[PDB]
Amino acid sequence: SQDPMHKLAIIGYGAAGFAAMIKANELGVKPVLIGKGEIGGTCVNVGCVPSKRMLYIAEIYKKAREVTGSEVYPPFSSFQEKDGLVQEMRKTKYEDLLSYYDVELIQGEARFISPHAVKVNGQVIEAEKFVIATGSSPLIPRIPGLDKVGFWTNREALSPDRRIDSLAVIGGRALALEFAQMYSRMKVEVAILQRSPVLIPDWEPEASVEARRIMENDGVAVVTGVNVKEVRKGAGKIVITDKGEVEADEILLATGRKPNVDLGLENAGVRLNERGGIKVDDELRTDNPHIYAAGDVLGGKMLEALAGRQGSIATENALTGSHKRVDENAVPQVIFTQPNLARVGLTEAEARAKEGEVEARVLPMSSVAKAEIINSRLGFVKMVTMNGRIVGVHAVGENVAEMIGEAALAIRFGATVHDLIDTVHMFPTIAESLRLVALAFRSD
Amino acid sequence: SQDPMHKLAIIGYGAAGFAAMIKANELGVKPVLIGKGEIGGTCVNVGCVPSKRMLYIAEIYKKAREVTGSEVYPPFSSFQEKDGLVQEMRKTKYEDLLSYYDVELIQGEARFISPHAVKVNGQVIEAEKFVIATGSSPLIPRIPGLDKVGFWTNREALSPDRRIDSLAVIGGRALALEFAQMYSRMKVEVAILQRSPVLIPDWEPEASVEARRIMENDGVAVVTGVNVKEVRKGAGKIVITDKGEVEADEILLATGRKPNVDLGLENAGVRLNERGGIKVDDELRTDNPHIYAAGDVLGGKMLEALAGRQGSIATENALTGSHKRVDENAVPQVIFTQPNLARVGLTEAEARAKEGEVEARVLPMSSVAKAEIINSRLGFVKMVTMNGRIVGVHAVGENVAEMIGEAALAIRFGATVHDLIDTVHMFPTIAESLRLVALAFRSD
Ligand SMILES: Cc1cc2nc3c(=O)[nH]c(=O)nc-3n(C[C@H](O)[C@H](O)[C@H](O)COP(=O)(O)OP(=O)(O)OC[C@H]3O[C@@H](n4cnc5c(N)ncnc54)[C@H](O)[C@@H]3O)c2cc1C
Ligand SMILES: Cc1cc2nc3c(=O)[nH]c(=O)nc-3n(C[C@H](O)[C@H](O)[C@H](O)COP(=O)(O)OP(=O)(O)OC[C@H]3O[C@@H](n4cnc5c(N)ncnc54)[C@H](O)[C@@H]3O)c2cc1C
């Protein structure tokens, strides 16, 4: 028999799929790239780019109100203005690359029909190797009355159909925090309804404390330990919980994301992991050794830079036979509230659960000169070492997102606290808090 | 003979001298610490702390005017308000340490009278070892009429005696840029008069370009290639130059700093270097092997974090017999205008002047997603490698001061561009510009 096949097919054209496409070109292969929906996927269109833009607008108006005492809020039109930036970035960063790089693009929904083939738009596409990069979708909880009453997800909260006065946010991790701060800074009365007893319960305890303070400082009502029983429609929307009824103009779901795995995977011998994403080994290879997967479809951390890195590594492993990995314990995550929350590596509890000598220190941000100078004293920097190497850094403070890459690099290099002590920082910066917390390991 | 002496005397109680005092305590020695003037020296009192505070105030009001369209400038009282922060920081960071650590403090002017002794307040103080950390003072150029007409230095520009409408700044390096932006953002008409053909002429060429644009964007008149011949008094102060007369309410000298070396050094066998600072080897030891020196008195880079590090290293080398050094080519410098200018390591020209394979790349800030998102597209990131190791990073952009410590750490570790490529950053941050410029080494 002979069965000529493409060398590589990539399923999905978001951050992971683009990274795969680029890598494939670099290794001398013209891939087939199959996607549906807006080019560039979640990040550029309904994710990191429009969300950070609206938080920037929120921030500059908040500062303007503090300085002037005026009640100036961002105009409702600022949501529509941001659509110009999205369009420009989608063009320059994604659409223009489809002209520059070599690729057979197909727009449509792919589903596996064999271990070496998909169907799309009724046609068979066969490939020697696949990279699955189909992303995630909003997770819609099963709550009586919710579908009938209707709700917003991120998509709608970024392009709102109307001006609202009140918002009930269901959920209490990063996206809830970001949208709650965003809408509260637009003169919307926001409540967060969180099931766990604290916000961001998989972060350091100190971070969960600060998360509450950040929200409350902008007038958000934070309700923790709550179970939502039902939703109904009154004058506005009524969320009925075991701690009372919360009425609001609109409901925003921020209860997580579900990997996009409705792909006929059983036809290709690909399995799901316990988190509902594609099951892969550390080299991003599935149970079918010709199929790799990358990005949010893995059901792991959901980050643009990690999705990109995984799309590159999956592609190289598929086309070269390499055995490359991307160490998730040096990958940073940031919540882009003001002040920022940032983390990379292990929490102290995670480190203490492994074998090894663990130390940890926490430096208050109120001790950092620059934080005093710019009136941003809320926060902290926490550093965790295992056998004398830095393995985790967690921080809350002004623009800590800008210093977390120093911490990531320190962790990749296995830097010790003396290594940081020996590195002259710039005074006065927020970043020199990394060296000040290192000094805390022996010094006061 | 017997001549009992103290183990260590430290001359000057700024950043270097404090660092020495602390280090001495850590090695089990109670030093004698001799200083004059305000405790904490330049940084806290008339340097980095009050200057960054006033630039912060300038910045938040500028943003408030952009957002509201109102003509709100910082009140003249904000200079006096900053004196509270200075006092608080002087107490917590310096005066309180004199109670916590063990030290014999003497306030007065020290001068050497022998290789092992100083005089202060008419008393002989003998020590086995000395660390000289006497700082620098403003450099006052010899210009006819200038002393009679009078001028401001940093001290006066930070605590102005009156409200002015116009300012002539003599000089064109970091402090000129910072004060020019500061006063222009206080509705003062500022002119910079610079002798060299460009601003900051020891920075990368790209930085000098950007420096001019930054100044001009706030309405500063930048005059380069000018020689100041004379000053006279008219209605206001008249600076006569070979390119015309510039009249202003006040004159600010920003023409550099002179090390404080009027110390009787010839009595102790200590010599001066070609830049007018104390001559030392890389271990901070002078020609008298019992005398070390640290900080701005060396006539090298003038930075708080470097002065601290040198005071620690000088002390350890003096008391333990070690041979430690502080590598100046991993020490960062930042100009805290908005946007910031930052640098660490070698310029491209400096690297190309040494033997080795040199590469360099420049990434525009307009290519960085976060810079687009926050409307701060002016700038660049330049990376220089020598034999495949990163040896210099230079950047202009919003809050680049916060990412320059990542670059410093990369340089200390001898990181390659692949090392940066392999480190997942956070999207969207300004800091991921370090990885984007690394990608430029092979990729477009
Ligand atoms: C509101 C919001 C804000 C965020 N902010 C940040 C942030 O600040 N920083 C950060 O790092 N991360 C952020 N994220 C997460 C980040 O956007 C994602 O982790 C990232 O987009 C992952 O990209 P991906 O390619 O793995 O998934 P996607 O980009 O969703 O890739 C899937 C793409 O493939 C196509 N596709 C899907 N299924 C199929 C199929 N069956 N057949 C054919 N084609 C298909 C779709 O068209 C889709 O565009 C945010 C997410 C959200 C929702
Ligand atoms: C306006 C301005 C802004 C600045 N901003 C920054 C910045 O943002 N970041 C940064 O890194 N750097 C900055 N600097 C530079 C920084 O302040 C100095 O490099 C730093 O203070 C050096 O400290 P030092 O201890 O070496 O000198 P000093 O702190 O001046 O130490 C000298 C001290 O010793 C005492 N002394 C001096 N001579 C004698 C003597 N003969 N006998 C006895 N005692 C003596 C004096 O009382 C003096 O306080 C700035 C400088 C200025 C002027």
Numbering used by the authors:
A (entry chain A), B (entry chain A): -3 to 440
Task: List passages from the publication reporting this PDB structure.
In these environments, biology utilizes a finely tuned protein catalyst termed the mercuric reductase (MerA) (encoded by the merA gene) in order to reduce toxic ionic mercury (Hg2+) to the far less toxic, volatile, and elemental form (Hg0). The reaction catalyzed by MerA follows the reaction scheme of NADPH + Hg2+ → NADP+ + Hg0. Structural characterization confirmed that MerA is a member of the DSOR protein family, which adopts a βαββαβ fold, and which is known to catalyze pyridine-dependent substrate reduction with a characteristic active site CXXXXC motif. Here, we report biochemical and structural characterization of a thermostable MerA from the aerobic thermoacidophilic Crenarchaeon Mse (MseMerA).
The crystal structure of MseMerA was solved to 1.6 Å, with R and Rfree values of 16.9 and 19.6%, respectively. Bound FAD was observed, suggesting that these molecules act to stabilize the structure. No mercury was observed in the active site. As expected based on the sequence alignment, a clear reduction in loop regions was observed in comparison to Tn501MerA. No electron density for the carboxy terminus of MseMerA was identified from 440 to 448, including the conserved pair of cysteines at residues 446 and 447. This is in agreement with the carboxy terminus being able to undergo conformational changes during the catalytic cycle. The structure of MseMerA reveals a dimeric biological assembly, as has been shown with previous structures. With this architecture, the active site cleft on one monomer interacts with the C-terminal domain of the opposing monomer. In contrast, in MseMerA, the F441′ in the position of tyrosine in Tn501MerA lacks a hydroxyl group to coordinate the Hg2+ ion, but a glutamic acid in place of the Tn501MerA V317 provides a different residue with which the Hg2+ ion could potentially be coordinated. Retention of 100% activity after incubation at 97°C for 100 min further confirms the highly thermostable nature of MseMerA.
